[PDB]
Amino acid sequence: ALFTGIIPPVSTIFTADGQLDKPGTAALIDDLIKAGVDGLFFLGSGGEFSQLGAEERKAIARFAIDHVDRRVPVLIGTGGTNARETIELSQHAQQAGADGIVVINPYYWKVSEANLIRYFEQVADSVTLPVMLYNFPALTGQDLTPALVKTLADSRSNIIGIKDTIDSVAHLRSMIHTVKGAHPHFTVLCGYDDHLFNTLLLGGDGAISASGNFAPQVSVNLLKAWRDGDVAKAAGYHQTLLQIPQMYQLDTPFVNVIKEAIVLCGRPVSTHVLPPASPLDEPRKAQLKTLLQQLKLC
Amino acid sequence: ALFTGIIPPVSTIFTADGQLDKPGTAALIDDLIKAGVDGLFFLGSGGEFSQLGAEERKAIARFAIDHVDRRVPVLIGTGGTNARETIELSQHAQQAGADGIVVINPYYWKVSEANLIRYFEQVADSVTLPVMLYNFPALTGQDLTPALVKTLADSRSNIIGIKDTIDSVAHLRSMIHTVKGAHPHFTVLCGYDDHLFNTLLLGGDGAISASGNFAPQVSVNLLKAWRDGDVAKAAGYHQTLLQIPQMYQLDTPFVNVIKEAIVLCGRPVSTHVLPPASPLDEPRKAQLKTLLQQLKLC
Amino acid sequence: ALFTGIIPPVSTIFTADGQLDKPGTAALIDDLIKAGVDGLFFLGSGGEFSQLGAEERKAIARFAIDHVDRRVPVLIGTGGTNARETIELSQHAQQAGADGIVVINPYYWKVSEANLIRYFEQVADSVTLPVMLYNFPALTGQDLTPALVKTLADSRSNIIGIKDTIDSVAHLRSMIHTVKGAHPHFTVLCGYDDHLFNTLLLGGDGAISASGNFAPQVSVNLLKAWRDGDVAKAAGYHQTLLQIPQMYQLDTPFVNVIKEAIVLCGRPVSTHVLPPASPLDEPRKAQLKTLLQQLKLC
Amino acid sequence: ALFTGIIPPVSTIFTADGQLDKPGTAALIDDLIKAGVDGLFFLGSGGEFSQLGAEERKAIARFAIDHVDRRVPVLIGTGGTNARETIELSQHAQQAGADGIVVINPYYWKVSEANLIRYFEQVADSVTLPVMLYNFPALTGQDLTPALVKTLADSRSNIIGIKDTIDSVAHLRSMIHTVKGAHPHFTVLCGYDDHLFNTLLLGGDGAISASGNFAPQVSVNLLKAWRDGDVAKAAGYHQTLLQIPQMYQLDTPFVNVIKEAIVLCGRPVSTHVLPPASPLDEPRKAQLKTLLQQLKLC
Numbered sequence A, B, C, D: 001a002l003f004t005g006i007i008p009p010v011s012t013i014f015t016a017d018g019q020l021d022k023p024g025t026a027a028l029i030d031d032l033i034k035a036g037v038d039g040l041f042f043l044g045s046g047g048e049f050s051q052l053g054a055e056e057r058k059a060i061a062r063f064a065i066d067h068v069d070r071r072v073p074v075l076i077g078t079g080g081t082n083a084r085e086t087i088e089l090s091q092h093a094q095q096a097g098a099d100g101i102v103v104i105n106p107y108y109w110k111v112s113e114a115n116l117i118r119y120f121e122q123v124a125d126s127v128t129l130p131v132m133l134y135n136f137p138a139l140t141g142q143d144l145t146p147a148l149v150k151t152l153a154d155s156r157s158n159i160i161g162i163k164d165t166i167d168s169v170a171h172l173r174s175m176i177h178t179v180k181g182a183h184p185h186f187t188v189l190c191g192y193d194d195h196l197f198n199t200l201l202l203g204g205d206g207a208i209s210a211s212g213n214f215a216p217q218v219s220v221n222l223l224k225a226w227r228d229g230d231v232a233k234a235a236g237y238h239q240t241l242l243q244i245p246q247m248y249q250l251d252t253p254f255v256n257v258i259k260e261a262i263v264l265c266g267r268p269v270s271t272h273v274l275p276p277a278s279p280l281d282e283p284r285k286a287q288l289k290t291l292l293q294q295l296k297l298c
C-alpha cells in the first residue's frame, strides 16, 4: 500500500506581495520532514491550488519536489475543472519528479457518472505515477461513493488510494469495506484530523489533514502508538485531534488559520493568503492562540 | 447531570397480529437491566413511536414503566407533529411514573425558530419531568443547532439534555462546547453506536443507540472501562461499535434488523414490525447473522 | 381524468379551544363552491392534518363531506407516518362518502423504495376509491420522482393522480411527460399558486393551492380563460398568482396567513391555528392586508 | 437598465484539437445577431469557461468582441476560483472592448459572507465596466440570495444586474422584489429557458438561456410579443420554451446537446466539447432530433 501514514497537505507560503515564498515554504517542509511525516502533499485545498494559475502551480510543484529532494514521498495536487490542464499538470508533476498525484473530481459541473469515470481513467492514463483520488463532497457537491471508487480501482491499476475528506464515520467505514475488500492494498486516508484514529481502527491507512502543518507530532505519534500496539496512547493523541478542528471555524476558507497556527507553534512565515481568502483578524488570531494553548500545542 | 451513560432505545415487541407483546417486551427489558444499562428509553425511533397511535403509545409507556418498576431511570418518547398530543403524552408519562421524556422537534413542517422555541417551552411547561431534546436531522429536516439548544437550556430549567443523532464529530463537539460550556451538567448523548467513544472523549455523557438492544454489554463495558481509566480497553469495545452500524444498511427503516439481532443474540422475541416497515427477508437475516458472528456477538 | 381543475386545500376553521368550527368551515366551503371550484380537498397540509389526532380527522372529514353534500367532488387527506392509521382513515373516508383520498409519503423515516411502493399499494388496495398521491419533498425529505409515480400508476389502476407541491418547472414537466405519457388520464395538479399556468401549458390538469381559500376566483377564472382559449386573459390572472406567494413568507407554518387572508378578503372566520403554529402578529397582519390591497384581492 | 432582453450564453465552437474555431463561432454569432438578440454573453457555463485556461479565455473573448464589432452589447464571463485571475480576465475584457463582465461566486470553497462581499467589491473596483453577477447554485453550492445581491447593489454602483440560474419562481420573484425594489434599474435575467415568461411577468428583464443558441427566435419573439402587448402570443412561444429543457437531460454536462441542436436547426458548426464533457452518442442525437422536430424547431 502506497502513501500510507501521515502526509500533510502542506501550506504554500507566499510573500506579502503574493509571490511564492521559497525560504518560508522550504523551512516548513524541513520542519515537517524532521517531525517524521510519511510524505508531503503539495497543492491540496489547504495548499491553495484553487486560487493559483496553472504556471504558478507548476513553479510551486517543481520547487517543492526539488526541495524535498526525495527525503519522503511527494504528492502533487493537479486537479480542477479544466481536464486538459489536469493532464498537463499531472504530466508536469511526473516530469518534475513527483512520486504521485492527487486528483479531485471536477467541481463546477457535476458530470455524469460515465464522464466522471472517463475523466479519472484519462488522467490515470496520462501518467505512470500512482494516482490518489480526492473526495471532498462539501466543496465538490459530488460524492465519490465507495462503489465508484472501487469501479475506478478495478479499471486502472495506478488508481491506488483516496483522501476521503468528509465528517462521516459511515463514509470511511464503507470506503474501507468496499474498496479495500476488493483491493487490500488500496490506501484510504481521511482528510480530517478528528477521523485519523477511527480511520486506523476501521482498517484504513492514515490522514492528510491540516494539523499536519502546525502540530504534526500529534498525528505522527498517534500513528506510531497505533503501530506499536499502544492503543491507549494513540487514544490520548486522538483526544487532542478531536479538539483541533474548532480552529477551522474561525474563517472560511481557513487557509489563513492554518498559516497563523504554523506561526504560533514556532515557525515564523509570512501568512499571506490568496484572494478570495483574506488575512485573519487579530481577535480571531488570539482565539486561535488560546485554542492552541489549551491543547498544549504552543 | 441526568440520564447519563448507556440508555438503550428499547425496541417495542409486537405479536404476529400486531399487538404489544408484553412477555417479549418484558424479557427484553429484564435482559437490558441485567446487562447493567443506566436507563431505558421507550418509544424512540427504534421503539416505533411514529408508527403507533397515541392510545397505543400510552398503553406501551404504562406497561413499560410498571414493568421496569423503578429499577433504572425510564424515559418516554412523547414527540411527533401534533403538539397537543405531545403535551397529552408527556403529562400521561409523568402521571404513569416516568422519570423523564424525550422530545423531537416537529418533523413535517419545519417551523420557524420562534415557533420551535415556543413549542419546546410549552412542552417543558406541561410537565415537571426532566426533558431531553432529540435531534435527528436526517429524518426531521431541521437541525437543533448547539446555539438553539443552549437558548432552550437557558429558557427552561427542566430542559436538561439531548440525544444528538447525527454522523458528525463536529456537531457533537460543538453541542458539548456550546451547551455544556454554559450548563456544565446538561447531558449530551450521541444517537449512534459508533460515536460513543468520541462522545466520551469530547466531554459528553453517553449514548442512546440501537445496539443497546442486542449487544448492551459492548457499550456498558466501554463506559465502565472509560470510567475506570482503562482507555485501551474502552478503545477495544469502540472497535466493535465502529463496525456494528453496517447492519443498519440492511433495510430502511431498520427496526426489523434490530429485532432480528435481538433474536440472533439469544433472546427469542416476535420480530413483527409495524407498517410501513416490513419483515426482514431471509437472505438479509443471514447477512445480519454473519456480521454478528464476525464481531463475536453471537 | 379525475379531480381536474381548481381544487382548494381547504382550511380547517377551529374555535379557540382547537375544536372544529362548523359554521365557519361550512361558510368557507359554501364560498368556494359558489366561486366555481371543481372540487374540495380536506385535511391537506393547509388543512392542518399533521396537527390533528385520528379521531379529530375523522370528525372533520365526516362533517365536510356531509356539508358539501355532493355539490362537488371531495378529497380527503389520509396520510401520516402510521400506516395502519392511514388505512383506517382512508376506509373511514370511503365510508363517510368521500370521492377520493390523498396520500403523502411517510415523512419521518424516508422508507426504502420497496417499502414505499408496498405502502402505497397497500393503501390503494384498502379502498375501492380513487387515490391521489401527494408529493411535498420540502417537508417530507423524500421526493416522489416521476419514475416512481409511473411505477405506482403502472401497479394500481386506482392510483390516478398526484398533487406535486414543488417550486420546480422541471419536476412538473417530467411528471407530466413520464406519467401522463404512460397514462394519459392520470391527473397532475401542482401544489403551488404560481405554477398553475405553467402546469396547464405543460399538459397538466390544474392546482391544489392555498390561494384557493381566499381568492378562488383568480384560479377559477384562469382555468375558464384557458379552457375557453383566451390565453391572454389566463396570463393576466397568472400575473396575480405569481405575486400571491409573497405572503406565505410572513410565517412558518403559514396556515395562519391563509386564514387571515380569508378574513381580509371578506369572510370572517375564526383564524385560530393548532400548535405548533401560532397567531400571526398585528404588524404582519397589516403587511398582509397591504399586499392583498396591492393585488386587488380586497 | 443595462443588458435587458434576450442575451444568449453563446456556445464556443472548437476544432477537434480543442482550439477556437473562428469561422464556426463567427457564423453562430452572426446567426444570433441576425435573429434580433439584444446582446451576447461569451464564456458563460454554456461557453465552457470552466474547461478553458486563462490565455485561452482571453483569446476567445478578444475574437468574439471583435467579431461582434459593436453590433450588440457584449458580456464576457470572467469568473472562476482564482480571484487574481478574475481581475486579470475582467481587466483584459475591458481593454478588449467588452460592454460588461459576468462574475459568478467562487465555486470551490464557498467563502464566508465577508469574503464574498469583499470579492465582488474588489472585482467591481477593478474595472470601470458594468458588472453582472451570476448565480448558479446547483453548480456553485452557494446561493446568491436576494438579500446578499441587494447588499452588493447597495455597495457598488457598477454591480448592475444578475443572471439568476435557478429553477425557482420564488427565487426570481424575491430577487426582483428585494433588489429591483431598492434599485429599479438593476437588471434581473433568468438563466433557464422555461422561466423567461414568468421573469417578464414578475417585473424582471429577460433571459440568458441555452436555447438562445439554436432557437433564438423563440425567445426574441416572445420578448417582442410581450413588449408589444400581445400576451397571448408571448404565452405561445412560452409553451415551446417550457418544453425545450427536456433535451438537456440527454447528458451532463449538456453543452454537447446544445451544439448538436445548433447543427440540427440548420447551422453546421463543429460540435466538439472540452473534457470532461464528451460527444453526444448517436442514439441520443436521434432523440434530440426527434424532440426538435416535435417542437417545430427544425
Ligand SMILES: *[C@H](C[C@H](O)C=O)C(=O)O
Pocket: A009, A043, A044, A045, A046, A047, A136, A165, A191, A192, A208, A209, A210
Ligand atoms: C486536504 C485536507 C482537507 O481537504 C481540509 O481542507 C487538503 O488538500 O487540504
Ligand SMILES: *[C@H](C[C@H](O)C=O)C(=O)O
Pocket: B009, B043, B044, B045, B046, B047, B136, B165, B191, B192, B208, B209, B210
Ligand atoms: C434513538 C437511537 C437512534 O435514533 C438510532 O437510530 C432512537 O430513538 O431509536
Ligand SMILES: [Mg+2]
Pocket: A009, A044, A045, A046, A047, A209, A210
Ligand atoms: Mg488542508
Ligand SMILES: [Mg+2]
Pocket: B009, B044, B045, B046, B047, B209, B210
Ligand atoms: Mg433506535
Ligand SMILES: [Mg+2]
Pocket: C009, C044, C045, C046, C047, C209, C210
Ligand atoms: Mg396548502
Ligand SMILES: [Mg+2]
Pocket: D009, D044, D045, D046, D047, D209, D210
Ligand atoms: Mg448555458
